[PDB]
Amino acid sequence: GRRLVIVESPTKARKLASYLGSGYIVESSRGHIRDLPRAASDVPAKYKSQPWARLGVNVDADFEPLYIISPEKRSTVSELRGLLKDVDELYLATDGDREGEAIAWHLLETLKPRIPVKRMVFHEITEPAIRAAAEHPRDLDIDLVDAQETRRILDRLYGYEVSPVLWKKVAPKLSAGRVQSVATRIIVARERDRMAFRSAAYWDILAKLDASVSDPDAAPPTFSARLTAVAGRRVATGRDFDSLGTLRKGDEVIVLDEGSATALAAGLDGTQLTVASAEEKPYARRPYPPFMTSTLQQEASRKLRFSAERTMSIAQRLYENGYITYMRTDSTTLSESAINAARTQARQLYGDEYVAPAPRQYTRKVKNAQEAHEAIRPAGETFATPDAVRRELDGPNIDDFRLYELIWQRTVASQMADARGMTLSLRITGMSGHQEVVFSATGRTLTFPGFLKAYVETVDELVGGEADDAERRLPHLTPGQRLDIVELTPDGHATNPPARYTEASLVKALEELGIGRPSTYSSIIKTIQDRGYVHKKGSALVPSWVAFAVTGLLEQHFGRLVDYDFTAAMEDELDEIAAGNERRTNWLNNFYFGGDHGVPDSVARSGGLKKLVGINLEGIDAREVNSIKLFDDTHGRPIYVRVGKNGPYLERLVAGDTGEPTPQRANLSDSITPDELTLQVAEELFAT
């Protein structure tokens, strides 16, 4: 009467056993047990006669893979086979997505069971959910397994073709990563934009206005307003300049400068201003959807200041320990049990009035219904309360509680009433000598906070901006109303360069572009940092010089491999395989060898990966690949950054003791971000 259940982790193994009980033996497999060979020694004697064995994929036989058991896992497999001898049934209880199905498949291929096999799938670890999945198994989904394998093979083939190019042309020991190099490109593209940015200056006037003489009961009696128009011409703002600091070809504006603006203020000093136009418009904010993988990583980054990787390790533990639903999901759907628990929680915590009128469903179409069933929300039909979870996850597990609290608040808020308020608009007029001038003020009231009492999104550190519960108080003003000028400050400004990415904004970008998946966002963000391509300056991601060199090589000579659209399209086709709408072998064959299928002008339609990469590379100069153009000096001489084996250093060709060509060099580190190394900075380190 003995049943064996296999999962990926000891924590999950202990948790399922607690729920299953007697007559079940629950073991862990440490994740994957087989992979393609990673070394010549991974190749078994039987295959040492196959020249493709080390590669591990036989491209001339429909991409047959060589899966071997990694030496680090041979132990695990031995024990599993040992235990299998003594049971009546095998339960495979890995995660329900393509990774988990692939593990199940591999266990079947490795153990070769001669007893019944049931495959359990669940998206939360509770006693009911576990019991249910045991009683109602799901057939192994081969389409999922084929999708995972296609991606595994693709990565192997990609590394095989592309790494040698990086080795000859950039640096040895660099490792190719296809999606990674796209993520890297996004970051490098932003740094270049910052480097080509040129600021424009623009001035206006800020006034403090008092309404208390014309209306003794104005609330508040004072406020601020900005100069918006002078003599029918609209004052220049930051949005009016392009990245080169020149005015955009649109409507007609005045750029004020210091002397311009203070002349206007001095000519105003004395007068009153007059309310020409007050307007109220109500607004209604709908609450945030429940968390999915990308939005959870974003909010944890902006609010808790957790890296993407950190958020996923914590979420993993919460899920394995029964606290939350599955944390790899692109669904924001809540089950009816969860909608009711949130509604109740909200009514108990905040009031009957703060509960949405009718229950709120957030049903967005998921890419694959087999891998994602539900948003990320507290597990169990009744949510474990934040205090109870706070006590269990105290001390060392404090980051786990903090994430749970974030998830709980988000779920609860998602069932709450709309935020209500008014948005205030003001047109104030006046006279600075000859010219008529317009000051403007805007305001927002939050009459009824709604879900915002339970959850408010955090604004991106670098982008800046206003939170969705921020209010600007303005007094009730009426046309004709005179206003007293309390103070006038002529105000100078400059346009700013485009903000760098935080992890939160990178994840957002990967999602909008269709390049990231719930299973991949954090591993993408993590790897580009490990491998040195990118590092953090505070909360900002900054590319390293080697990132420029690699990105440059790929853009110049293999552009399709790092094109945002081609990348997204491939991610989509892999999902197509997962659904059963495209075949593993056809896809690999088209991708590697070329074919007539795929988005126009893609790798597949351009002759395949193999012909694409294997051009004549002797035409590609390593020296230029490792040279990043910065600018010319005040003598017309190109100054570039050279990526050398000893690292990054600045170089320029100068006139020597005889003449040119003489290279003048100066060494460089992390301390100087690319957009910080200006000509001033460069000259300063060429000399000292």
Same domain, 353 and 434: no
Q: Which two three-digit tokens encode residue 680?
A: 């001033």
* Residue 315 to residues 277, 289, 617, Cα–Cα distance (Å): 52, 18, 45
Which residues span the domain enclosing 134?
1-146
Residue of 323, 326, 521, 533 marked active site:
326
Q: Kindly state whether residue 21 falls inside one of the protein's structural domains.
A: yes
Distance, CA of 316 to CA of 299 (rounded, Å): 17
Q: Which residues contact 531 (CB under 8 A, 6 or more apart)?
A: 174, 175, 177, 180
Nearest to 163 by CA among 181, 180, 175: 175
Q: Which two tokens stand for residue 338?
A: 């969860």
* Cα(182)–Cα(567) distance, integer angstroms: 8
Same domain? For 335 and 280 the reply is no
Q: What are the CB-based long-range contacts (under 8 Å, 24+) for 360-364?
A: 360/287, 360/414, 360/415, 361/333, 361/334, 362/289, 362/290, 362/332, 362/333, 362/334, 362/414, 363/332, 363/333, 364/289, 364/331, 364/332, 364/333
Q: Would 664 be classed as within a structural domain? A: no
Termini Cα distance of the chain? 80
Which residue has 């080795």 as its token pair?
167
Q: 131 with 189, same domain?
A: no
Residues 298 and 381 in one domain: yes
Is the same domain home to 491 and 503?
no
372 found inside a domain: yes
Tokens in use for 348?
């108990």
Radius of gyration over alpha carbons of the chain, in Å?
31
Q: Which helix (H) or strand (E) holds 687?
A: helix 679-687
The identity of residue 21, as a single letter, is G
Residues 109, 2: one domain? yes
Comparing CA positions, the residue from 129, 147, 156 lying closest to residue 52 is 156
Contact 624, 170 (CB under 8 A): no
Classify residue 197 by its DSSP letter: -
Please report, for residues 14, 152, 437, 631, the alpha-carbon distance to residue 73 in angstroms, rounded to integers and kept in the order given.
Answer: 20, 19, 77, 53
Helix, strand, coil percentages in the chain from 3-state DSSP, rounded to 5: 40, 20, 40
User: Are 483 and 272 contacting, i.e. CB atoms less than 8 angstroms apart?
Assistant: yes
The first and second tokens of residue 178, run together, are: 């296809």
Phi and psi at residue 60, to the nearest 5°? -90, 0
Residues 271-281 as b or e (16 or more Cβ within 10 Å = b):
ebbbbbebeee
Residue at which a domain ends, from 443, 473, 497: 497
- Residue of 278, 280, 288, 279 lying closest to 419 (CA atoms): 288
Tokens of 356: 């949405």
Return all residues near 457 (Cβ < 8 A) that are at least 6 apart.
Answer: 288, 299, 302, 467, 468
Assign residue 308 the CATH number of its domain. Answer: 1.10.290.10
Cα 297 to Cα 503: distance, rounded to the nearest angstrom: 8
Residues 6 and 137 in one domain: yes
Q: Counting Cβ atoms within 10 Å, is residue 288 exposed (0-12), middle (13-18) or buried (19+)?
A: buried
Measured in angstroms, the resolution is 2.5
- Alpha-carbon distance of 361 to 289, in angstroms, equals 9
Residue 672 in domain: no
Q: What is the 3-state secondary structure (H, E, C) of 312-371?
A: HHHHHHHHHCCCECCCCCCCCCCCHHHHHHHHHHHHHHHCHHHECCCCCCCCCCCCCCCC
Take residue 554 and report the two structure tokens written for it. 């790929």
C-beta of residue 518 within 8 angstroms of C-beta of residue 218: no
Residue with tokens 């892999």: 574
- From 400, 417, 434, the end of a domain falls on 417
Q: At what angle do helices 142-169 and 545-557 cross, to 10 degrees?
A: 100
* 326 annotated active-site: yes
- Integer Cα distance of 260 and 256 in angstroms: 5
Residue whose token pair is 């169990």: 380
622 in a domain, yes or no?
A: no
Residue 384 and residue 325 in contact, taking contact as beta carbons nearer than 8 Å: no
The approach used to solve this structure was X-ray
Please, after which residues is the chain broken with C–N above 2.5 Å? none
Same domain for 359 and 269: no
- Exposed / middle / buried, residue 48 (Cβ in 10 Å: 0-12, 13-18, 19+): exposed
CATH code at 246?
Answer: 2.70.20.10
Cα 529 from Cα 281, distance rounded (Å): 47
Full DSSP string of 130-187: HHHHHHS-----HHHHHHHHHHHHHHHHHHHHHHHHHHHHT-TT----HHHHHHHHHH
Give the integer Cα–Cα distance in Å for 3 and 488: 81
Q: Do residue 247 and residue 321 come from a single domain?
A: no
Residues 184 and 235 in one domain: no
Q: How many domains does the chain have?
A: 4
Three-class SS of 410-446 = HHHHCCECCEEEEEEEEEEEEEECCEEEEEEEEEECC
Q: How far apart are CA 311 and CA 152, in angstroms?
A: 25
Measure Cα distances from 294 to 98, 208, 270, 516, 564 in Å: 18, 43, 55, 9, 18
| Residues 184/453, Cβ–Cβ less than 8 Å | no
Q: Could you tell me if 88 and 122 lie in one domain?
A: yes
Q: Does 678 map to a domain?
A: no
**CATH classification at residue 122:** 3.40.50.140
Residue 422 burial (CB < 10 Å; 0-12/13-18/19+)?
middle
Query: Is 427 a domain residue?
Result: yes
Phi-psi region of 173 (alpha: psi -120 to 50; beta: other; left: phi over 0): left
Contacts of 38 (CB under 8 A, 6+ apart): 70
In this structure, the answer to whether residues 189 and 325 fall within a common structural domain is no
How far apart are alpha carbons 500 and 193 in whole angstroms?
10
Distance CA 431, CA 494 (A): 27
Residue 76 lies in a domain: yes
Classify 40 as helix, strand or coil.
helix
CA dist 352 to 51, 187, 342, 409, 450, Å? 71, 47, 13, 17, 11
Residues in the chain: 688
CB atoms within 10 A of CB 308: 24
Measure the CA–CA gap between 280 and 442, rounded to whole angstroms: 10
Fill in the amino acid letter for 84: L
Where is the domain boundary, 417, 450, 483? 417
599, with CB counted inside 10 A (0-12, 13-18, 19+), is middle
Determine whether the annotation assigns residue 8 to a binding site.
yes
